[PDB]
Amino acid sequence: SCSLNCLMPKHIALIMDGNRRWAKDKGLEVYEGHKHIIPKLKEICDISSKLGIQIITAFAFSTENWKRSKEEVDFLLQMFEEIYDEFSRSGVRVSIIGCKSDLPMTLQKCIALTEETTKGNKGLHLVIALNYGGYYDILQATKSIVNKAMNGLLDVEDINKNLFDQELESKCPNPDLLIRTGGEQRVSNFLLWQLAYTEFYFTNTLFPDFGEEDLKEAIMNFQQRHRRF
C-alpha cells in the first residue's frame, strides 16, 4: 500500500580522486600522491570557511578500496592517523562516518581523539567518510529500523523519508553541490540517498592540483545552474 501523490552552496560533497595518476605523471612513487590528501583537504576547509560554506563531506576511503594491494591499503590506513595532527589544533570541527571497527585500533583511537578535541569548534564542519559506502549506509539504517520494529517502537506504516533520514550516518541538510576531481563521471558508491537532488560537477583537475581558483570556478558553475533551473 503505497501513495506518492529535507546562492552559495551550504554543504559540498567532495570525491578526492586522481592522486596516483598525479604522482605517476611526475615520476614519483604512488604514495607521494596520497601524502597530499590530508594537507589539501585542510587547505580546502580554510578556503571554504572564508566563503561561508558550512559543511564538507569528503570521500577518503570507500568500502571497495579494500581490493587494492596490501601494501597500498596498509600505507593509507597508517597515513590517516595524521588527521589528528592536521586538525586537532585547527578551527575545524571534524567527524568520521563509516565502519570504524574494521580499522586498526590505533586509527580508531586517533579518530576518537580528533572528534573529541574539535567537538566545540563553531566553524566549518568537516565530515570524513572513511571505510564508507552508500550501500553500507542504507543497510545499517535498515537494520536499525528493523530492530526498532521488533522492539515495538514503530509500525511499518511509520516508515517514511523522514524516519529513514534520521537513521543514516549523513543526514539532512544534504549536499547542494558534489565536486569530483580526477576526470571520472560516476559517484563510486558515495552518498547515494543523500545525492538525490544534488548538482554534479566533474573536473579533470587531479586532487593534488585542486586549488582556490578551481573551487571558485565550481561554485560559479553552481550559481549559473540555479538561474537556469
Added chain:
Amino acid sequence: SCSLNLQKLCYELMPKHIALIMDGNRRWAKDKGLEVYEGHKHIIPKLKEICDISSKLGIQIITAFAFSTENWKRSKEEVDFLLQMFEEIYDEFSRSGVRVSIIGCKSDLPMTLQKCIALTEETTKGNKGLHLVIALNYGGYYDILQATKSIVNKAMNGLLDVEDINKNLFDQELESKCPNPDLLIRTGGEQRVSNFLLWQLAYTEFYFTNTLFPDFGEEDLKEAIMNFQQRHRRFGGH
C-alpha cells in the same frame, strides 16, 4: 555491529543496461513555436525508435524515466495530458518484440491507466527481445522505502534475521533489479539525477547532453555509446 572488509557488484564494450532521463520536451515545443505539450507527444514514438536502435546494437535493457514523484506538482492540466497520453504504450509496443514492464506506485493512477498497464505487461511478457522498463510514479526514495517495509514485515514474521540483511537481500526487494545500468543518459542540459535510480547507480557511468529529448536520435545515441566505450571502469580497485 559492522564489518565491510572481507568481500557482489551488478555491472558488466557494449552497455547491457542503459538508464534514460528524457528531459527538454517543453523547451523543444517553444523554440519550434508549437503548443506547450507537443514535445510530450513525441516521448513514446521516440522511445520506440530508441528501443529499435538499441536492440540492433545489442543492448538488453532500457529503463526510461517517464514520470517522477515530483512531477505531481506540475499544473493539473499538464498532469492529465501526460497520464492520458501514456495510454498509447499499448498500440506502440504490444505488436513488437519488446518486453515491457512498469515500475512505481501503480495504485495512485487512473484505473484506466492501471488496466492499460496490466494489459501491456501481460501481452508482451513472452517477448524475447529487449526489455523496456518504464518508471511511472517512481522515485529512488520510494524504491528504497518499499523494500525496507517488505524486509521489516518479513523480520516481524520470523522469515529472516537482522544478520541476513545484506546487499543481495536488498537487491532482491527493489523494483529495479540487477543487472544495474552501465550507462545513464540525461538529455536536456541538467547534470543531476533528480531522485531517479539511487541505489542502482552506485557505479553507473554518467553521460549528460544539452540535446533536447525530441531531437535525440540515432546519431546522438551512438555518440553516447562511443563516449561510454572510451571510459575506464575501476570499481574501486586497479
